[PDB]
Amino acid sequence: PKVRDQEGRMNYYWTLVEPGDKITFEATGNLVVPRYAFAMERNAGSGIIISDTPV
Amino acid sequence: GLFGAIAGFIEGGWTGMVDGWYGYHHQNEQGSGYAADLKSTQNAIDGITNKVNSVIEKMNTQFTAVGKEFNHLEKRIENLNKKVDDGFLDIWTYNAELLVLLENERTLDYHDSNVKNLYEKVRSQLKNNAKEIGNGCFEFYHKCDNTCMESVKNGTYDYPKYSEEAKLNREEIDS
């Protein structure tokens, strides 16, 4: 069914590559490749507030 | 109250005694006025202070983020997460409510006990040198000047010094 005029679909995937590890992509089609990725350090555990309250 | 003094045989309070919880009012020839009992007041203050800090400080919560997010196919764990939150909600609410109710009761009794004990401490000193006229007042059977009054508040009233004068006025008044 057309969503935002599209009858096709795009699935989005993610993984965390450890320092020093390699990730490999192989494709003969249908790959939305990364362009930007993100180096990050996760700290403990927070959450997501959904609110109109101003910062 | 539990001990019968506050709102009991001492019917009302004193807006005029502003320097303490419990204390004394005297009237003699040289004057009249209020004086707080500093020792019993400080002691009671120490008790209630300690009590408040206990109810507040024994709760030592850790850093947590309550919220949890579940997708449309994770309803069962979402309801489990809600059961946790609602279970905690019910417990703390019940326990805080009852806690406050129980300690408020214990607190009022405590004041009530303290007044009674003060009254009893004076009665034990005065003995037969004064008349218990109810409402927490003692009417002395002898002249009590400012020095005398203070000895009573300080706990060093000299029963034998005035016992004779009192005995005269006591058997005179009792015809």
What are the chain A neighbours of B81 within 8 Å (beta carbons)?
none
User: Measured on CA atoms in the order B6, B7, B8, B14, is the torsion positive or negative?
Assistant: positive
Q: Whose CA is closest to A39, among A25, A53, A24, A19?
A: A19
What are the chain A neighbours of B69 within 8 Å (beta carbons)?
47-48
Measure the N-to-C terminal CA separation of chain B; round to a whole number of Å. 37
Identify how the structure was determined.
X-ray
B32: three-class secondary structure by DSSP: strand
Chain A residues touching chain B at CB-CB below 8 Å: 44-49
Question: Is-contact B31 B51, C-beta < 8 A?
Answer: no
CB pairs under 8 A between A and B: 11
For B108, half-sphere exposure in the C-beta direction (CA atoms, 13 angstrom radius) is 12
In angstroms, how far apart are the furthest CA atoms of chain A? 47
Resolution of the structure, angstroms: 3.5
A3: three-class secondary structure by DSSP: strand
Rg of chain A on CA atoms, in Å: 17
- Euclidean distance between CA atoms B61 and B142, whole angstroms: 62
Q: Closest residue of B to A45, CA-based?
A: B65
Question: Is-contact B143 B29, C-beta < 8 A?
Answer: yes
CB contact under 8 A, A47 and B65: yes
**Domains detected in chain B:** 23-174 (3.90.20.10)
Question: Cα–Cα distances in Å, from B126 out to A2, B132, B163?
Answer: 98, 10, 10
Q: Closest residue of A to B66, CA-based?
A: A47
